[PDB]
Structure 1
Amino acid sequence: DWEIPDGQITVGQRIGSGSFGTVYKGKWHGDVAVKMLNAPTPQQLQAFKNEVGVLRKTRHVNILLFMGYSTKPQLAIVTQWCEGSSLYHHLHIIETKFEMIKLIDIARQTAQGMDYLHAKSIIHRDLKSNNIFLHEDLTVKIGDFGLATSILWMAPEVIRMQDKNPYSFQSDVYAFGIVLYELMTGQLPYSNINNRDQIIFMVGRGYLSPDLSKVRSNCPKAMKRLMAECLKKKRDERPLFPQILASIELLARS
């Protein structure tokens, strides 16, 4: 079992809070991250069993490591502690300038993790650079580091919400396409539009899409074509991760 026996965790500094939990740094055989999700309602009890259920199906280096869960006093999920910042932070907050080979490597490791989740029939549903951690500044850890459950990474069919369920291996691929655009541009899509509602309406109709012409000239053609393919408006034109990963792997070998 992964139940952490009671009172073994030394909860330290609070890292963040939102409507759906509070996250702390803890001590449990070393540093850990602890997310505490509250007396708990049945909506909350169910979301807890779901996240635990999904986490415990994963053992891969590019996916954040689940370590256990506590049930009392509060519902809590315990994972490894990550050191450093999200890809979002590096690209758009402290604007780190990475060597092309490092951008491509970030791309590779994210594709590795996603390929993995999908091999297990796990749809992420919220992949964004903010949920890509660069641990030790070198290793990608995909998780969900947010506390609020996000439109720039949302596939057109997700926005319309007309074919519901709209989430699919392919909506994840789209999001990943938006991550590659960030990698290869240093920027978020649609930065010259300052109106959320319109981006929403325009992406969902296919009126607006990421400006691929902004892609750095030192980016390999093959990476640019991969981006355009992932970003495809009609979901089943998008490659899946086995194909996505093989491409990044192929181009890196050059």
Structure 2
Amino acid sequence: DDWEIPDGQITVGQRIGSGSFGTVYKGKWHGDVAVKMLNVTAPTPQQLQAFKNEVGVLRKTRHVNILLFMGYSTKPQLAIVTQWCEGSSLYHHLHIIETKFEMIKLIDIARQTAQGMDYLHAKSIIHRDLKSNNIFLHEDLTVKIGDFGLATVKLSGSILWMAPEVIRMQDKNPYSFQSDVYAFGIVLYELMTGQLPYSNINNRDQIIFMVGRGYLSPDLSKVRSNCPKAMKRLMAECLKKKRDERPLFPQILASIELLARSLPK
């Protein structure tokens, strides 16, 4: 098939924020959309390989909890268009406006997110950057996973969600399904404590270092009083410092659809 969206069809609008490659604008193309572009006119053959990669990946995804890729554009500048999500990122809800979710909606946001990663994984896609910033609550329900980049709030990197092996840079390709599972674990941790990990440490390098040596890990004793003992039990199985001791998502997903089935009281 062809998803090439011809020249002049897209109508760029308000500037939303900086995207992986160029900048993300909220535009129009048969309804509101997001357009991520390249600001410079020069296609670095090392950048185009990336655009031609991102488009290559979104194209494989088609599911309620992954952001909807709707089409790409090569004509002036290179762009990738996704549906426009009305709402905020989970990171925004949790840590900025400090929204207070009830345990049910929480478990659910958790369950959708898991539901989502599962799909990406079944399609043999590693996300490599799952985190509350990249989890979008479209219309306040319906988790939408994507890699929004620097659009959405807040050489560097996002340290908190990296599993140790990653934070080390062991064998040049540290990333795995279990990589994601950890990132998911920290997300669980966020949902269950409304906080980010290691808030009492104000030194990035030390966080990187210790989380790497396995001297530091999330303080699980901060889980909200009413959290189900199985959510907490799962949280840890996901944040295991040993790559191979972590659960993959088909199990994670089920462990959730189980604990979510028994707690309306």
TM over 0.5: yes
Which TM bucket (shorter chain)? over 0.9
RMSD value over aligned CA atoms? 1.3
Unpaired runs of 5+ residues, structure 1, are: none
The 3 A distance-change label for structure 1 pair 19 and 32 is: closer
TM-score, normalised to structure 2, is: 0.94
What's the secondary structure of 1:141's corresponding residue? strand
Kindly tell me the number of residue pairs found equivalent between the two proteins. Answer: 254
Task: Give the % identical residues.
Answer: 100
**TM-score normalized by structure 1?**
0.98
C-alpha displacement of 1:148: 9.1
C-alpha separation between the residues in 2 aligned to 1:137 and 1:75? 31
How far apart in 2 are the matches of 1:184 and 1:170? 20
Equivalent residues of 1:2, 1:67 under 8 A apart: yes
In the TM superposition, residue 139 of structure 1 has moved relative to its aligned partner by 1.0
- State the Cα distance separating 1:129 from its structure 2 match: 0.2
> Does the 8 Å contact 1:20/1:147 carry over to 2?
no
Partner in structure 1 of residue 166 of structure 2: 158
Displacement over 3 Å in runs of 4+ = none
Over 3 Å counting, the alpha-carbon distance change for 1:28 and 1:241 in structure 2 is same
The 1:59–1:20 alpha-carbon spacing in structure 2 relative to 1, beyond 3 Å, is same
Structure 1 position 145, deviation (Å): 1.1
Q: What is the CA-CA distance between 1:17 and the residue it aligns to? A: 2.1
> Within 1, Cα distance between the matches of 2:188 and 2:253?
13
Q: Which residues of 2 match residues 48-63 of structure 1 at below 5 A?
A: 48-63=51-66
Aligned to 1:18: 19
Matches within 5 A, 1:161-200: 161-200=169-208
Q: Gapped runs of 5+ residues in structure 2? A: 153-157
Residue 163 of structure 1, CA deviation:
2.0
The C-alpha deviation readout for 1:116-154, integer Å capped at 9, x for no partner, is 000000000001100000000011000011149900000
Q: Is the 8 A contact 1:112 1:245 kept in 2?
A: yes
Preserved CA contact (<8 Å) 1:156 1:204: yes
Match of 2:93 among 60, 82, 90: 90
1:21–1:147: 8 Å Cα contact kept in structure 2?
A: no
Query: C-alpha deviations, 1:160-180, integer Å up to 9, x for none?
Result: 101221000001000000000
